[PDB]
């Protein structure tokens, strides 16, 4: 499993792979690990599939209910704070998950939350078994001045490196771009396939 | 135990074997592992017999009650979502089962659900101790363009390979075909017996 | 790790993949797991790399020394018997390996030997984490009447199925063909690459 | 694994099946578990394959050497006594085997020897996971007055019952008949195949 | 402990032995393990005596109460389903029992239920430590075309074989015959004693 | 297992049963547990069969060698002392046996020796799982003034009581009588069978 | 601890010893282990003193209350059934006791109940560490045709044998005789002392 | 700890950092982890300091002795083979090290050897806790066509990324370049310091 | 993690670093560990991030609510007492944190509170893995007569020493100064960066 | 325990405290932990007293013997290398010590050696429970340009800080100065006592 989320000047880019291991061995090649949970909020999931899917449904209900009562979207920091409280309340019977939350309320944010509810903001973050390989790519190539197109290429390259070195990761790459002007936009598979050919990652 | 479920253009094919081991050794040769739970929905069970049979009765009651109140069949994804919630709620005192759910609401679907409630859609899936042998057959022979008759032959061949290599699997093969035009149809034993002779699997 | 060995009318075909996991994660993509140990004898190795490489060097020395003194090649059954004695002598401090030995003295043979020294002859055999997927392909497609060219295609297809489903296996496929008329011949990489394109395994 | 040995008026009948489980699952269907170790002596092996095969080679060497020096065959009781000493000497680092020794020096004998070296004579005995099913057949049908042909049918029926109920047993049945007038005679596979059709065990 | 239940054309035959071990050693020779729980329903018990006796009293109350309210006997499958629910509800603090339920609602049925609530129908079944010896006798001698008298002889022979080989079983054999025309009839001890003399089982 | 040894005015009486349990369950009904080791010395064995049989062969060799060099039989106390030294020397890797040694040098003696080499003389002693039942019979019926015929009846009755209550004991009763005037005499099976009918123990 | 209960034609005889071990070593020589719980019902207790004494007080209250409401004595089988329910209800936090219940409603009965609530009727039964020695005496001397006086002598002899061989048992013997004509009668100590002198048990 | 070794057209580049943790916490900032062991051979060490330093002294002695007797340098593959034998010989009391060996006999080679003696050749390899971050940089930037100067920059960038993300790594970077024309050349600290300023890694 | 808090004549100085380790390795470089919880009260957190962040939110709510009802700020000792009660109430399911509380009600105070609720006042205190290095600096350089500017330099030097020796600590240094005249003032990053250059800590 | 060793331009300064804990509690206040082992070599010991004292005697003998044969002092690096070999040879039955070796052959050196034999050179090093407090003082105050007098003051201040914070350390401070011009000179206690008064450490 490899998930990545980065921040740009007015954009948030999130991308994951699709390989799912269940009862050992590769039993699913096209799993879903990137979810839209609000108008300008996305979440990626790593860890146990059962716990992660339950949390995704919980956040979708809470954020939609919050929107209807407050007539405004939940701020990204409030989204991470709410998740932090839920995970810490059952820390001794915990969800075995690692989560990334990203979006734009007035500025782009990416939050990393662990199983015990520890939440911390960062310009970029990666989770899963393939994350350390991604951090190597981001440490040497990430720049806050990149354009959206350049940022999409970077996350594709970073995940491609993880797929070469992490056996638990694989499959087709899913990419979502979040901006105020376009909202939550999931990039078509044909565009990403074109990008990998142009980038040289086969 | 070997269960398999595949998707076609407008059909779902599910098939299991019948060998049951209880108190070790082969004590039942003609167990039941394939159940119809709705008009266009079937489920296969692997793992502990006691937990699996309880879940089958639960799903039959819930789906029938859902049909009476909503005047429509439960969607296949909703069936898997409901099962996911029940299994995850008791994940620390869990059902020791692996489940496959398949059917047609408007398109064919097959869902794989683990003990912790992790649910993921796939074009085909297999569970049980004999599943890895089935995956080898499906990896090299499955095609989305097969007809219903060809798909029935494939699952018979895949399970026959598992019976040759997995001592926990055995017995007569049960096959069910689900289409909108015919509903849930369980293939007669005489037809499957004829197929194995024609296929060459003795 | 996935190794396979099959017997034909006057030929032995052995093939393995190249992925090596060390300190977890994929640290080598082009490992060597298929060795020629005599004029008409090959061996494949699965398990711990350190123990396997030591055994390969031992067999090369013993078989060459046996050839010089007896002026004849060691029979394939004698090769498996010698390996069986060495592994069983240290069964309580054992080599953590699974081995396949194949060759032609006057007829083609393939032998499977476990860590405790259990040796048994078979028409075909497979070892490693990806072996159960290979057995599914061989159960439904192997025939003793195939030609050498058809047999090469079968092992390529069987390993390709294992690479799709076993995360521990991967990399380029190595194939060796043993006959009395040509001796031990390792197929060139360009030929196997051509075969996969013609077979359709990408 | 299922082995059986019975005594008649002037004959010894021994029979085993061929299924071998290695690294779990059925990896060999035609293993060898019945060995001739002297002119009028046979042995069957159950348990770990590696330990059993080493013991078979040891007994063949010892019995042949004993024959050359003493100019007479080793008595059957002496064969069991020699095996008892070897197993008891390493009882704390033991061979994980169960053995049956049968033959005729001047009368038919069958000996059962455990891992700790306990040897006891019996009119009939069975070893392996399928042995309790065999004992049920022998308890209700064995008679010391049967002919050789009737005795061959009984062991075929007893093993066939074990194959129906023990998943660890399977494969083709091997039968050997020992008499002074014919020596050690292994029944051809075609004859046993004919017998099962005539007996009704499919 | 040895219990057996078989089905015939219009009859159900159940039989157990009487040996009870408590605080080790044979402390009771004439225990009761075969109970009538309804007009055409019987149950046999294996395992812990305390748990088994509690369940027997529970089933007698439930079936009688069900009869008074519904004015009809509980169907045999419903009897097994009710038992399955009770055992599975406390599976983590379970009854250490193995149960057989047999009877005739409109056809003869025999059900086997384990401690976790797994229920499966069979033509014949056996429980207890002596059950594998019984299965050997039934595998080679049972026929669906036997008469009631022949079926009584078979279960007597099968249990007699278990008493010869299982030290935990022993004592006098209890036999019950269930038909619609006669109801639940327990065979007199004098008749069974006569049968064993005629059968030759001493 | 039940062995008993008693002393009379000029006689020693030893008796055992024959049931042997190996790999659990009753696999041998006619085992041998009473051995003559010298002209006027016998030994009974309880515990592990392998260790016991090795010790019997050791004592036969040592006592015969002692007789040839000293021209006299080894005294019974010396026999127990020699056994005590051997067992105590390996007390931390011990023989899992309980032994009874009886005979007449100039007076009748019975010695009981444990696994650690503890040897103590007694007028009567019993070993095995059925021994406590034997002690109850001997406590209430043994008399030092009985004749040889009365003493034979007592040990038959005591073992018969153990067979009724100890599932590990069973089979035909073997009896040996040792006197100076007759030496070591093993009572024929026909005589003991007659005695049980006359005694009333069926 | 040694308790015994036997049945005769119209009588029930129960007897125990008095030795109590607490904090190891013999700290009480004249403990009480035989209780009258109804007009024609007695109970003996073995195991932990604290649990046993609580149960005795419970049964006295329940049986007296049952008598006042139903105007009849509780049947002996009902007494054992009530005890069985109480012990099985707390089987996972159980009373560490073994109980014997005897009396006459219309016929003499003796019931043995274990810690888990298993209840079984027998003609005679014994509990405690000294019970196996008692069973040896009863196996060889008990007769259903004995008179009350002969039955009293038998239980005195059986317990005396247990006192000679079981260090946990000792002290003066308490005997109670239950008949319809005399009710529950506890034999005076002077009479039992006279009996032991006449019997010869010192 | 972070070590890296890469191969070029006619060069080998090896580089490590200097942080050493002992008794936890950073107790040495300028440790030595890159050693020259022959004229054209270098080795890097990761793991326990004590075991690694002993192995370095062993290799220096063996390679120098080999050079004096054979009048030629040990081939790089022979260097790895010798190390493999030593580590595998004590695999159950092993050196807790991970090693990289690089050099030029006639072509550039880099070998990775684990604690159990597993040796495998690669174009580039990395060891230590910081290695996964290095692999990410190498996966996306390494090219076999780079010059020596470009290759030096790459390893500096890769280690700098590891120092940012691995707390166990740190300190000044040591770089060695091996060519036939210049031999083993360790780059001066002033040059590497200049490179980091020019590269932008602060 | 390294946090420090010191007291001066009319001031409290608190400072922490920013390195956060999650799922091992440095995944965040700019974490937040210094919080303002009241007008003149600050708190630093060490240990598990999830537990610490929950406690910070709890204290902010409690102190604000206390201020609104009492119209006065909570005294610093009362702040530590309230925290002590909460932590001790769940001491067996505790928060895995170490806390420092500092501020001015009428005099400067610094309180150290452990996981079990132990609270003790001190002139200066340090927590985290880097704390022992800080104590060495404070033991040799702290003076109660320093000015605010000198005190700011001391905590910067102390944390800088910890960053050199503790791998778990790192990142930019955050400093807060609390006085009655200025309230809670967090020093700008530019000022601290200037201080480190002037101090010589690079 | 607190030991420290530093290097200067032409001098080595080593200093330890004297507190020894044995059977817990402070049982010796004036232990010896600083030893002269050669003309210009000293060693400090931390850990188990018994192992440390044995090593000191070993080094004194080896260095003196080396001096007599080679007519030159052992180089400081050779001293550490010899110690490294001895400790690593028994690493699985090791000396539980931490050692510092310092001296001047032609330049000043200080070596730190762990229990497993890991040796590494440093400009300064500290061992024992009080070492982390010493490192804090050295991190903020050490300079390579200090004079001998200034260096003596620094180690006195560093150890004094450790005595304030480490309960395992205490007692009078021992200081040794090593130069080529004066050899190994142990500073008198009166001088160090004067220094502490002048330094202000009471």
UniProtKB/Swiss-Prot annotation, chains A, B, C, D, E, F, G, H, I, J:
<dbReference type="GO" id="GO:0005737">
    <property type="term" value="C:cytoplasm"/>
</dbReference>
<dbReference type="InterPro" id="IPR023333">
    <property type="entry name" value="Proteasome_suB-type"/>
</dbReference>
<keyword id="KW-0645">Protease</keyword>
<dbReference type="GO" id="GO:0010498">
    <property type="term" value="P:proteasomal protein catabolic process"/>
</dbReference>
<keyword id="KW-0647">Proteasome</keyword>
<dbReference type="Pfam" id="PF00227">
    <property type="entry name" value="Proteasome"/>
</dbReference>
<keyword id="KW-0068">Autocatalytic cleavage</keyword>
<dbReference type="InterPro" id="IPR016050">
    <property type="entry name" value="Proteasome_bsu_CS"/>
</dbReference>
<keyword id="KW-0888">Threonine protease</keyword>
<comment type="function">
    <text>Component of the proteasome core, a large protease complex with broad specificity involved in protein degradation. The T.acidophilum proteasome is able to cleave oligopeptides after Tyr, Leu, Phe, and to a lesser extent after Glu and Arg. Thus, displays chymotrypsin-like activity and low level of caspase-like and trypsin-like activities.</text>
</comment>
<keyword id="KW-0378">Hydrolase</keyword>
<comment type="similarity">
    <text>Belongs to the peptidase T1B family.</text>
</comment>
<keyword id="KW-0963">Cytoplasm</keyword>
<dbReference type="InterPro" id="IPR029055">
    <property type="entry name" value="Ntn_hydrolases_N"/>
</dbReference>
<dbReference type="GO" id="GO:0004175">
    <property type="term" value="F:endopeptidase activity"/>
</dbReference>
<comment type="subunit">
    <text>The 20S proteasome core is composed of 14 alpha and 14 beta subunits that assemble into four stacked heptameric rings, resulting in a barrel-shaped structure. The two inner rings, each composed of seven catalytic beta subunits, are sandwiched by two outer rings, each composed of seven alpha subunits. The catalytic chamber with the active sites is on the inside of the barrel. Has a gated structure, the ends of the cylinder being occluded by the N-termini of the alpha-subunits. Is capped at one or both ends by the proteasome regulatory ATPase, PAN.</text>
</comment>
<dbReference type="GO" id="GO:0004298">
    <property type="term" value="F:threonine-type endopeptidase activity"/>
</dbReference>
<dbReference type="InterPro" id="IPR000243">
    <property type="entry name" value="Pept_T1A_subB"/>
</dbReference>
<feature type="active site" description="Nucleophile">
    <location>
        <position position="1"/>
    </location>
</feature>
<keyword id="KW-0865">Zymogen</keyword>
<dbReference type="GO" id="GO:0019774">
    <property type="term" value="C:proteasome core complex, beta-subunit complex"/>
</dbReference>
<dbReference type="InterPro" id="IPR019983">
    <property type="entry name" value="Pept_T1A_Psome_bsu_arc"/>
</dbReference>
<dbReference type="InterPro" id="IPR001353">
    <property type="entry name" value="Proteasome_sua/b"/>
</dbReference>
<protein>
    <recommendedName>
        <fullName>Proteasome subunit beta</fullName>
        <ecNumber>3.4.25.1</ecNumber>
    </recommendedName>
</protein>
